[PDB]
Amino acid sequence: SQAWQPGVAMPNLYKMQRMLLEKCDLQNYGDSATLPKGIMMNVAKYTQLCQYLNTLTLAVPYNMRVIHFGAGSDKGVAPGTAVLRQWLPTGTLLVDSDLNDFVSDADSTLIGDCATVHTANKWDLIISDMYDPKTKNVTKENDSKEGFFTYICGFIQQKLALGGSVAIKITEHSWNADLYKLMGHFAWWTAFVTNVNASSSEAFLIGCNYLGKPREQIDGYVMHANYIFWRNTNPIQLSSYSLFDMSKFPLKLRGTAVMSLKEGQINDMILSLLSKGRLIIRENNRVVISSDVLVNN
Amino acid sequence: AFAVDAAKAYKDYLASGGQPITNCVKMLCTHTGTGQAITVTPEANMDQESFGGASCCLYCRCHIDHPNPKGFCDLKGKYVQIPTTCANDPVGFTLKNTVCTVCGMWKGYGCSCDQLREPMLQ
Ligand SMILES: Nc1ncnc2c1ncn2[C@@H]1O[C@H](C[C@@H](N)CC[C@H](N)C(=O)O)[C@@H](O)[C@H]1O
Ligand code: NA
Ligand code: NA
Ligand SMILES: [Zn+2]
Ligand SMILES: [Zn+2]
């Protein structure tokens, strides 16, 4: 049924529950979907994420600015970055970053901890696939994680243009209470599970149209428990079916308006335009980025 | 005067039975594209595979300078169409082949600029 969709978004009713946290036990665990010949899992995963993002009210201005965190791989290449560049309009600026060196199709690549990444500019879309290797290796009470997630929360609150959107990868153990709270700072949000990786607790927390303020107060600990309850009670069938029809894959270049308004000029009319993906608020200055280099003997 | 020749080294490595560079990023596409060699988005036809450009570039993959004054790369940030019969070694294919500056198709794998003039068609 939902097997022909790119994946499944968490139904809104789960966001209004007050579930107690417990282990994520997936019925369809261990299974795997049929990947098309020679296609890497991450190409399939990003393709389904992008297929789902196409159904949302993403702002797509000319000269769109996209930053991709956790773009490297043990292979030394950037599969997700290749998909994002395929998906995004040709005139989009794409910057990627990772702790380890890698070869990328992005306009610029920064190597090092995301905590070392600096930018004087605001972004229109933030994609993160960052995942700490120790999250698997070492077992721990499932509390909110504060490594790269603290950086992402700060980056969203200071470098995301109003109207901008995010897709941040989380898992049962790789999550952050403050990031769930920030989902309430968007016109709409969801947890999206790709059908090709439905056997994993992985999901992309998608914030659609940033408002720079909370439209809803969200308790992150309760919302992650709500997310796990959904994963434990609504099994998602593994499926690669959406990967075989790429005819409507490219993100449509909407040419969304970009304006540099003051924090005092943000009225209810502006919030309404931001909420429909019809407006991006940020300056349009030289896109400048850098990665700190620790100096030592 | 000394200069490392990575192209020659990879070709000799392949001729000696060396395993071709792996993990070239193959993209999902309709396979109803123009079939041109290097494009801004996947353009594979029914007889080609589209790959992320940087992953199919010997210089990018080996982390060595590009052989030209500006050190510019013609694959990075683009998509390279590789004949399915050669998709097992995209890095070797881009090295051993040349893009026609006229039609944008690979010479010997799509470029028809040198075929005898066709009788005009209504
Ligand atoms: N603090 C951090 N800063 C930057 N990158 C990180 C950090 N922690 C983990 N990562 C990266 O997160 C990545 C997780 C990978 N699964 C990403 C796969 C990649 N998205 C792909 O397209 O294949 C690893 O390459 C890590 O190096
Ligand atoms: Na594109
Ligand atoms: Na660095
Ligand atoms: Zn290159
Ligand atoms: Zn030609």
Author numbering:
A (entry chain A): 6800 to 7096
B (entry chain B): 4271 to 4392
Please give sentences taken from the publication describing this entry.
The structures of the heterodimer were determined in complex with the methyl donor SAM, the product of the reaction (S-adenosylhomocysteine, SAH), and pan-methyltransferase inhibitor sinefungin (SFG). The nsp16 protein catalyzes the transfer of the methyl group from SAM to the Cap-0, generating the reaction products SAH and Cap-1. This reaction can be inhibited by SFG, a 5′-aminoalkyl analog of SAH used as a pan-inhibitor of methyltransferases. Here we determined the structure of nsp16-nsp10 bound to the pan-MTase inhibitor SFG and showed that SFG has nearly identical interactions with amino acids side chains as the natural substrate SAM. Notably, SAH and SFG interact with the same residues as SAM without modifications in the site or the overall structure. The high resolution of the structures with bound SAM, SAH, and SFG could facilitate the computational design of small molecules that have higher affinity than SAM for the SAM-binding cleft and have specificity for SARS-CoV-2 nsp16 compared to host methyltransferases. Thus, the heterodimer is the most soluble and stable form of the 2-O-MTase complex, and the dimer of dimers in the large unit cell formed as a result of crystal packing.
